[PDB]
Design a protein around this ligand. Structure first.
Ligand SMILES: Nc1ncnc2c1ncn2[C@@H]1O[C@H](COP(=O)(O)OP(=O)(O)O)[C@@H](O)[C@H]1O
Lengths: 49, 371, 292, 338, 49, 8, 134, 47
């Protein structure tokens, strides 16, 4: 019973960890695309000169 | 269907099993006990010497001594007794019918391999036997052929790096800091609490205490501050005679001698520094892979929090651009045997066996020719 | 403190020295190490062979920027192919950087690079692979004389033994409409059942084979016969100024290696001697028998 | 044996007055000179490649005279006005000659769209230009070349009549100008597009030279016509990139220029060109079931004498030997009563 | 016994997803840093007057 | 097998 | 980066038999092969240059099959008879094939004064030979 | 490297660079220019 309860402890801890890291990487991709667009418009503004 | 035998020996633990099996059949401590009290009871069972699991049951009336210390055997007769008990009492198989696979430490004197081969052919009439490196088999059990491995047993600690299946002999590092020395240190630091343990059975009791109620601190000074300022880090152990002791502060003090040997006063550096130096001794081009693949082996590395502290201490010494990751399989106690169970199962390994007839014209040095 | 060395360049041979400097800097086989377990032996062998052929084709001057792609079928499982990523030149092609894609250009394995596959270059290879199951390697090439011989009315005249060894050759008309699906069917019947060499009209050359070395042998003979035909008909300007030999009764004339292995093995001996450390398996690793 | 020369020594020299965008323009226009050197199309400078800096103030980047294409650095190039006077001189000790710039100026007064000009003197391009027919559409590269204009060149572009004649005959929308008996001129909004067109013209010129050498007469070449189908080259460069979103949209010569310029950066040419698409090499990933995931992401004083201790114990033992009688210490309270 | 073996098998299934998500985040870091230095160069060119 | 081939 | 290959290495072996000034003249053939690699005329293995050793007993020297012109050494040559059968093989562990020697053997059977024969397949000579004008 | 690696069609030029490395053309030194004219010394360089 103790050993199964330790397994459950590990289950819930890592289950929370995966959700935290997943939302973090989703955030990173979301604003990475934004600076990707912004550098392109800056270089296009240089090209307009 | 004759199948090979895998016998893993270490100071304090002997395992044995058929090749190709998931589990070893026999696991028992490598202990030899001799009676110490005056035996007066005519007609009932007495023996000259007890060995193995039966000897651990009668710790009260026995003096327990280990044939191996620091990976080097001290009395070969006790080793013969353990091997005979393994072959006959535990597995109930004839030693002269099946081949046997044996393991040892990488750095060792000349005479050990020769004496071991001579005893294994002459006493048991083994048709074929082979010697392998423990840590290499552990890396094979992890299933990657490259990376640096750390095997820390109860006899000795050693880190070897293996690249493309080759262990570089110059980069092998060996440190004489094992779990038995940690048990002695735990006994010495439990002396100051008021509990005194002196006999060998009490040493086994202290070892069980260490296995049950020890953990590795992430920050040493902060954990000292927390343990001094509060009573939260206190657990109670229940002795076999009914007495109850409180382990208290010492729980993270005994394993910390692995990282700082200044507590024991050893001249050598820590285990993480030993791993870092072993990585430094290798070529630059492979160092990335050495920082990318590192597995932990041995029963000493079963302390909770060993992986996080190891990763932090390696990352502290590593360059900032390097990526550090530590692999810790849950079955890291029995990895070596598992690797042996891999190595004997291959179709190219039947030619790797040492021939019985070839030993007759070669002699005891034949293993140095073939291994 | 020092950049990697650059070999000095001939006035007309600068980029050959460029490729050989780059190849001595970056090995073509970098999968050796921790990545050996990632790929099985059969697929790693094809990756090494294809990357080595890409380096060889860039060395010989047969590369036309990134517009050309050379594909090989993976023997493992079914309908998986290897291709260079779009954006990477022929000189930086390594074994691990090759991209594995299935039929019709969907990406299965991304590879070590961030680049994606251009499916427009893979349409022709997909059509060729769907046409014949025995074809494993397809090499599409563009030599300067090849466009000249492809623009010809008569095509490749069998005036050289190199052109005689190729046999029956197919011709694919350059429609230029860029149809979505009819190009595949047109190519499928225009190859026919068995044609080792196809010459695209006004575009370039392509050779097919069940092995890498055989396809390279066919494309080398095709390039050589192309040069022979171009020079001979440039001098001739009419059938009365040349003699043409018929093929039909010209053809009346451990186990050893298969077709085309000599030229390929000698060229990897060049590449290993030049410092590419390809790790290509050799039938005879040493030129000389060892001393007693 | 040291042919590597740093192409961006602007930061090292620190002895020039650069404009708003010179840091990118100078490296961008020296890279094409290095590529012309590596392809071997030209080795001795005849003022081949010219750039326009800004539209508000018409300044133009040109190469100094007497400098080979191997020796071209970004800081060595000079900028001039449309008339030909020197505005700012580069860090090169050479006499200044702007005689060949004037023809390029004849392009700049006509078309505000064009920004970079490349002139070619290769044997194949001059063979096609000197040929009675133009670039015959007999190859795929010639189809990718596009429409083009022919003009007779006679060595001078300094009088007004020749300049206005060239600007009239060049037309509003033309990208390639073929100067008869002199070669070809490629016009570009961007450097990448013009280098793309230069490469395609060179390939098509070599193809045409070999083809017309091979066959006597044009009728034997069974040439196709660009005009009959009139394609818009749609559907080219289908992309399935993982890091970015998959789009067909790309410029005419970015994707070919990025790989060449990364080639140049790999050896040690310290170019300042910004890559629109970043590249990372990473080790490949495993999905074998064998692989296991990682677990994580004073007591003694400093100055003392042992001889002091020995002398002290000798003093005590001497009193032991003498056995002198002496009472113990007495309290001060008992000292009061005596 | 049954719930213990269930929970342990669940942990063994979850670890691979943990490692894959971590690798994806590290790759997004690398792509982050490349464009950060790219904007550094672009704003260095733009800042001159 | 090929580590046995050259040595040990 | 492997260095350039030495041309004369027959002193290293010292196992093949030698007849008269063979120690010199073998090397000559190797030089010719190297000269071809300096001119780009031929870099793939074929029966280009054969040499008659002595006027008597009809012994000839040919290049081994499958060996590129850059890697031909003095000790790697193959000694055969007029029929093409191998008499004294060289120090090259490659399979032997003498089907391309037969035309040179016919030329040698024609003229006793002819000693050295050179054959090339370069584009200029092939275009001239394909040309009916010659 | 005594010899530079050779292109498939440019071996002779590679040997020309190698011989330029091995043997310099300015063979005349301070001690080796005795009893020699100045203008002839200048012209031998160009030739
Ligand atoms: N569950 C555990 N937790 C912590 N330490 C342990 C545990 N089990 C064993 N150990 C330590 O490991 C040692 C046994 O190591 P072992 O793997 O038997 O070495 P070897 O097999 O090489 O002799 C014991 O002395 C004990 O101190």
């Amino acid at each position: 019973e103790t050993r199964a309860e330790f397994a459950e402890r590990s289950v819930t801890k890592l289950e929370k960890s995966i959700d935290d890291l997943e939302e973090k990487v989703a955030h990173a991709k979301e604003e990475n695309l934004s600076m990707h667009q912004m550098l392109d418009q800056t270089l296009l503004e240089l090209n307009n000169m | 269907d004759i199948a090979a035998l895998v016998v893993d020996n270490g100071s304090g633990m002997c395992k044995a099993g058929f090749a190709g099996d998931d589990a070893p059949r026999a696991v028992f401590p490598s202990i030899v006990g001799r009676p110490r009290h005056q035996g007066v009871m005519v007609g009932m069972g007495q023996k000259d010497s007890y060995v193995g699991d039966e000897a651990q049951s009668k710790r009260g009336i026995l003096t327990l001594k280990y044939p191996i210390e620091h990976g080097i055997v001290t009395n070969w007769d006790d080793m013969e007794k353990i091997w005979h008990h393994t072959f006959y009492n535990e597995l109930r198989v004839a030693p002269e019918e099946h081949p046997v696979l044996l393991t040892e430490a990488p750095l060792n004197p000349k005479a050990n391999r020769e004496k071991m081969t001579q005893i294994m052919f002459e006493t048991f009439n083994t048709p074929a036997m082979y010697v392998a490196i423990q840590a290499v088999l552990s890396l094979y059990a992890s299933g990657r052929t490259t990376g640096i491995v750390m095997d820390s047993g109860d006899g000795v600690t050693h880190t070897v790096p293996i690249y493309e299946g080759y262990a570089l002999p110059h980069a092998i590092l060996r440190l004489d800091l094992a779990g038995r020395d940690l048990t002695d240190y735990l006994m010495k630091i439990l002396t100051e609490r008021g509990y005194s343990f002196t006999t060998t059975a009490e040493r086994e009791i202290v070892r069980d205490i260490k296995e049950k109620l020890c953990y590795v601190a992430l920050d040493f000074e902060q954990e000292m501050a927390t343990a001094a300022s509060s009573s939260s880090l206190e657990k109670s152990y229940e002795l076999p005679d009914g007495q109850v002791i409180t382990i208290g502060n010492e729980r993270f003090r005994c394993p910390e001698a692995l990282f700082q040997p200044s507590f024991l006063g050893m001249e050598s550096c820590g285990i993480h520094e030993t791993t870092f130096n072993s990585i430094m001794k290798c070529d630059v081009d492979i160092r990335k892979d050495l920082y990318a693949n590192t597995v932990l082996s041995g029963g000493t590395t079963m302390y909770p929090g060993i992986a996080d502290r190891m990763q932090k201490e390696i990352t502290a010494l590593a360059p900032s651009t390097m990526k550090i990751k530590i692999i810790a399989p849950p079955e890291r106690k029995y990895s070596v045997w598992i690797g042996g169970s891999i190595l004997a199962s291959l179709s190219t390994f039947q030619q790797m066996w040492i021939s019985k007839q070839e030993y007759d014209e070669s002699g005891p040095s034949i293993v140095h020719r073939k291994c | 403190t020092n950049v990697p060395n650059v070999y000095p360049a001939a006035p007309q041979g600068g980029m050959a020295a460029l490729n050989m400097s780059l190849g001595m800097v970056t090995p073509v086989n970098d999968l050796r190490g921790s990545d050996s377990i990632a790929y099985d032996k059969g697929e790693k062998l094809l990756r090494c062979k294809l990357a080595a052929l890409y380096r060889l084709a860039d060395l010989f001057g047969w590369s036309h920027l990134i517009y050309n792609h050379i594909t090989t079928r993976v023997s493992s499982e079914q309908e998986h192919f290897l291709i260079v990523p779009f954006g990477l030149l022929y000189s930086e092609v390594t074994a691990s950087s090759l991209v594995k894609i299935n039929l019709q250009g969907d990406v299965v394995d991304r590879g070590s690079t961030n680049l994606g596959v251009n499916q427009a270059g893979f349409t022709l290879h997909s059509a060729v692979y769907a046409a014949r199951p025995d074809v494993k390697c397809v090499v599409h090439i563009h030599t300067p004389a090849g466009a000249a011989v492809s623009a010809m009315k008569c095509g490749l005249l069998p005036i050289s033994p190199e052109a005689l060894s190729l046999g029956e050759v197919a011709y694919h008309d350059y429609h230029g409409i860029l149809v979505d699906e009819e190009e595949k069917v047109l190519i499928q019947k225009n190859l026919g059942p068995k044609s080792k060499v196809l010459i695209l009209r006004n575009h370039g050359l392509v050779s097919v084979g069940e092995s890498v070395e055989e396809a390279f042998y066919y494309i080398h003979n095709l390039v050589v016969a192309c040069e022979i035909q171009v020079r001979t008909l440039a001098s001739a300007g009419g059938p009365d100024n040349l003699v043409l030999l018929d093929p039909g009764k010209y053809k009346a004339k451990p186990p050893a290696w298969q077709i085309g292995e000599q030229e390929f093995e000698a060229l990897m001996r060049m590449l290993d001697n030049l410092g590419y450390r390809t790790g290509y398996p050799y039938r005879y690793p040493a030129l000389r028998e060892k001393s007693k | 044996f040291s042919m590597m020369t740093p192409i961006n020594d602007l930061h090292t020299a620190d002895s020039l007055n650069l404009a708003k965008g010179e840091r990118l323009m100078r490296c961008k226009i020296s890279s094409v000179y290095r590529l012309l050197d590596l392809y071997g199309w030209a080795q001795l400078s005849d003022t081949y490649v010219t750039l326009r800096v800004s539209k508000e103030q018409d300044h133009f980047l040109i190469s100094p005279k007497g400098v080979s294409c191997s020796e071209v650095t970004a800081s060595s190039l000079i900028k001039v006005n449309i008339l030909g006077e020197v505005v700012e001189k580069g860090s090169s000790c050479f006499p200044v000659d702007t005689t060949g710039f004037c023809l390029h100026s004849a392009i700049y007064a006509a078309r505000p769209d064009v920004r970079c000009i490349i002139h070619l003197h290769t044997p194949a391009t001059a063979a096609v230009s000197a040929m009675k027919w133009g670039l015959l559409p007999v190859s795929h590269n010639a189809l990718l070349v596009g429409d083009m204009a022919y003009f007779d060149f006679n060595g001078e572009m300094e009088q007004e009549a020749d300049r206005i004649n060239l600007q009239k005959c060049l037309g509003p929308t033309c990208k390639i100008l073929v100067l008869r008996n002199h070669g070809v001129v490629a016009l570009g909004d961007t450097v990448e597009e013009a280098f793309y067109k230069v490469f395609h013209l060179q390939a098509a010129c070599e193809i045409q030279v070999s083809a017309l050498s091979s066959a006597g007469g044009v009728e034997n070449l069974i040439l196709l016509e660009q005009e009959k189908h009139r394609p818009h080259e749609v559907g080219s460069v289908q992309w399935a990139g993982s890091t970015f979103g998959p789009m067909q949209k790309s410029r005419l010569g970015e994707h070919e220029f990025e790989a060449l310029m990364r080639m140049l950066d790999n050896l040690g040419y310290r170019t300042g060109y910004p890559y629109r698409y970043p590249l990372v090499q990473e080790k490949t990933k495993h999905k074998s079931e064998v692989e296991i995931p990682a677990t994580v992401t004073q007591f003694v004083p400093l100055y003392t004498d042992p001889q002091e201790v020995l002398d002290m114990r000798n003093k005590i033992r001497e009193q032991n030997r003498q056995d002198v009688k002496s009472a113990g210490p007495q309290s001060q309270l008992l000292a009061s009563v005596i | 016994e049954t719930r213990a073996e269930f929970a342990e098998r669940s942990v063994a299934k979850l670890e691979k997803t943990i490692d894959d998500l971590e690798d994806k985040l590290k790759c997004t870091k690398e792509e982050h840093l490349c464009t950060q230095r790219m904007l550094d160069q672009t704003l260095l060119d733009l800042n001159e007057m | 097998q090929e580590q046995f081939k050259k040595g040990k």
